Amino acid sequence: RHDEYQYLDLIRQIMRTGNRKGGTISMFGAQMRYSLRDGIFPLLTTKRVFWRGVAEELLWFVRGSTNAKELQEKDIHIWDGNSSKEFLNKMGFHDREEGDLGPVYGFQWRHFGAPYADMHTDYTGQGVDQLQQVIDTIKNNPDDRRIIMCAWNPVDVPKMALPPCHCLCQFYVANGELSCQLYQRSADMGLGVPFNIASYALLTYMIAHVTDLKPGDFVHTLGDAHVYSNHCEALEEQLKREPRPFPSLKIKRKVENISDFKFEDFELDGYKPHP
Amino acid sequence: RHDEYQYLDLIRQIMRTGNRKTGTISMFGAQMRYSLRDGIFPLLTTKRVFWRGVAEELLWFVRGSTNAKELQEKDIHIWDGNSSKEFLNKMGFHDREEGDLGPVYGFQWRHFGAPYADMHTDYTGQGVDQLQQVIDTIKNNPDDRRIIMCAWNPVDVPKMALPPCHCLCQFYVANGELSCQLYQRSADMGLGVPFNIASYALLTYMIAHVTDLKPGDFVHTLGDAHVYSNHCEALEEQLKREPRPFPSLKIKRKVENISDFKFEDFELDGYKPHPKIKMEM
Numbered sequence A: 001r002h003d004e005y006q007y008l009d010l011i012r013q014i015m016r017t018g019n020r021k022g023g024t025i026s027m028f029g030a031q032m033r034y035s036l037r038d039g040i041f042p043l044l045t046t047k048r049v050f051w052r053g054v055a056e057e058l059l060w061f062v063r064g065s066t067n068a069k070e071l072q073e074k075d076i077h078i079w080d081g082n083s084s085k086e087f088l089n090k091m092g093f094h095d096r097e098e099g100d101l102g103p104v105y106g107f108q109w110r111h112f113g114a115p116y117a118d119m120h121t122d123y124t125g126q127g128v129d130q131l132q133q134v135i136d137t138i139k140n141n142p143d144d145r146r147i148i149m150c151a152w153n154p155v156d157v158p159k160m161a162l163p164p165c166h167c168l169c170q171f172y173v174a175n176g177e178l179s180c181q182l183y184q185r186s187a188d189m190g191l192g193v194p195f196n197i198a199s200y201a202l203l204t205y206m207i208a209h210v211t212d213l214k215p216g217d218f219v220h221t222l223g224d225a226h227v228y229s230n231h232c233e234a235l236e237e238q239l240k241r242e243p244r245p246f247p248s249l250k251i252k253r254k255v256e257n258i259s260d261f262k263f264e265d266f267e268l269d270g271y272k273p274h275p
Numbered sequence B: 001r002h003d004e005y006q007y008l009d010l011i012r013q014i015m016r017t018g019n020r021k022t023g024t025i026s027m028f029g030a031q032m033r034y035s036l037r038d039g040i041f042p043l044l045t046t047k048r049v050f051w052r053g054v055a056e057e058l059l060w061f062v063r064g065s066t067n068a069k070e071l072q073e074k075d076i077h078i079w080d081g082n083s084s085k086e087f088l089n090k091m092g093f094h095d096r097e098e099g100d101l102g103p104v105y106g107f108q109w110r111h112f113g114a115p116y117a118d119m120h121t122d123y124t125g126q127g128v129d130q131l132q133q134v135i136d137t138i139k140n141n142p143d144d145r146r147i148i149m150c151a152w153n154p155v156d157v158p159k160m161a162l163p164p165c166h167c168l169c170q171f172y173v174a175n176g177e178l179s180c181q182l183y184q185r186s187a188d189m190g191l192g193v194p195f196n197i198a199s200y201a202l203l204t205y206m207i208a209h210v211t212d213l214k215p216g217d218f219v220h221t222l223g224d225a226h227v228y229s230n231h232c233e234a235l236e237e238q239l240k241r242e243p244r245p246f247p248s249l250k251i252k253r254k255v256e257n258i259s260d261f262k263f264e265d266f267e268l269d270g271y272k273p274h275p276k277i278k279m280e281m
C-alpha cells in the first residue's frame, strides 16, 4: 500500500470522528512511517507540496539563521507575517528589527542554550551545536540511543516569533540505514503536514549523505493532529484522489559537511502531483 | 481487545523481526494508546509492577527533588546505582555528594533553565516551572496546542547521572477529558516500559484531578524500543500470559494543588498481576 494512504486515512479519520473545537476538528496522538529507501522521496502527490520552500527553509535552518530577510531574498515568504516590525511590536519585542524572528529553529539547532541578542550577533562557540553533535554521534557511536536534536526550548519559546511545531527529532542507525523520528506537537493536516514530512525526510537524506549511510525511514509522530473546518470540503475532494508513485531524490555530488549543501545539489525526479 | 496486548504484540514483533545490535534487539518508532477512563489504571498485569515505586518516584519528581536519598528513606532503590559517590566520580563529577543525581527530571519539570548547583540548593522562583505552567494552561486555555513539559535539556544532559529517557510530554483536552502523550527516546520492553506507562498514566490522573477534568488517554510514543538478548527466554515466558483486567485507581480526597499529593491519597483496587520474571543485567 502506497505510504501516502497513511496521511489520507488520518485526514478521513479526523473528519469522521475528531473533536470539534471553536474552528478545527482534531485527534490526539498519531504516527506515520515513510520509507526513504532506494532514492524514494515522500513528497506528497494528492496535492502539490512547495518543494522549493522545503529545501530553502531547511538550508536556512542548517546555516543557523534567524533572519527572515535571507528567505525573502530567495522568494520564500513562509516566515513573512511573523517578521514584520508591526507583528514583532504586538508581541512585546520593541528593539527587534524587521526580519528578526528571535531564537527559532536555526538558533536552537546550532546554539541551544546561548543567550539570544539579535539575528546579526556572532554566536560562534556559544550553546550546543546539536546538528553537528548528531552527525558526530552517527559516525562514531551509531547504536547510541540519545541521538536527539531539540528545538523546544522552554526558556526561549516566549522570545520566538512563533512557538516551534517541531519539538524534537531523534535518529537511529541499523542495516546501513539512517532513520529519523519527528515529534510534532501541532499538525495542520491540510496545509502543514505534507511540507513537514518533506522537511524531515530531506534532513535525513542530507545527514545520511554526509555520514555514509543510506536513508531508512522517516517516522512522523503527531500530538494535536487537526483539520481546519474551512478546509473540509477541499479535503473531501482530495480524498477522492489516488496517490501517484513518489518522486526520487538524488544528491548530485559528494558533499563533505552538512553546512556545504546548496539547493542545486538536489535532483528531484518524477514529481507528478495531482492538480 | 485488552490494551496490554499492544505491549505484548510489540515485544513479539521486536524479537521476531528486530535489528540485532550487551546485545539488544530493537525497532525504531512505535506508539501505544491506553485508556485511562472510568477509573481504569493501566498497571500492566503480565508481570507484577512496582506500584509503590512508580507513585513515590512520581511524587519525588513533582517536589522537584534530585536527591536519591529521599527515595532510599522510603525503601525505593531505583536511582541507587547512579547516585553512589563512586559512580558519580566515574562520570566526571568530583564535587558531587552521595545521592546528588544532578539536574534530572524533578529539576527540569520545576526549574528548566536554572543553573544547577547541588541537590540542596534553593531554586525557588528560578527557571521555568513547566508543571505548574501545564496546569495553568489546562485551566485557562485548554485548547492550547503547546501544553508541553520537556525534560530533555541539551545544556544539562551532560550534568545528569543518566540522560532522561522521557524527553517530553504533551497534554490535550477534549470533552472534559485530559490526555497525555509521552515521547520516550529509549524503551526497554522488559522491565522499563511497564513502569513508564504507570508513571505517566498516574501523572495524568493527578493533573486531571487538580484541573477538574477526567483522565482520557495515555499515548506512549517510543524511539528506540528494544529488548536485551539475555531477556529473550524470560520474554518468551511472559508472552504465554494472558493480561488480567486492569485495576482501578481512585484519589481518596479533594487535592487542591499538584504539590499536595501523598502516597496514601491513592486507592489502587483489584491489581491481580502474574508473578515477576527475573530480567537481570
Ligand SMILES: O=c1ccn([C@H]2C[C@H](O)[C@@H](COP(=O)(O)O)O2)c(=O)[nH]1
Pocket: A163, A165, A186, A187, A188, A189, A191, A192, A193, A196, B145, B146
Ligand atoms: O510547520 C508547521 C507550522 C505550523 N503548523 C500549523 C499547526 C497549527 O495549525 C498552526 C500552529 O498553531 P499553534 O499550534 O502554535 O497554535 O500551524 C503546521 O502544521 N506545521
Ligand SMILES: O=c1ccn([C@H]2C[C@H](O)[C@@H](COP(=O)(O)O)O2)c(=O)[nH]1
Pocket: A145, A146, B163, B165, B186, B187, B188, B189, B191, B192, B193, B196
Ligand atoms: O525509565 C526508563 C529508564 C531507562 N530505561 C531503559 C532504556 C535503556 O535500555 C536503558 C537506558 O539506556 P540509554 O538509552 O540511556 O543507553 O534503560 C527505560 O526503559 N525506562
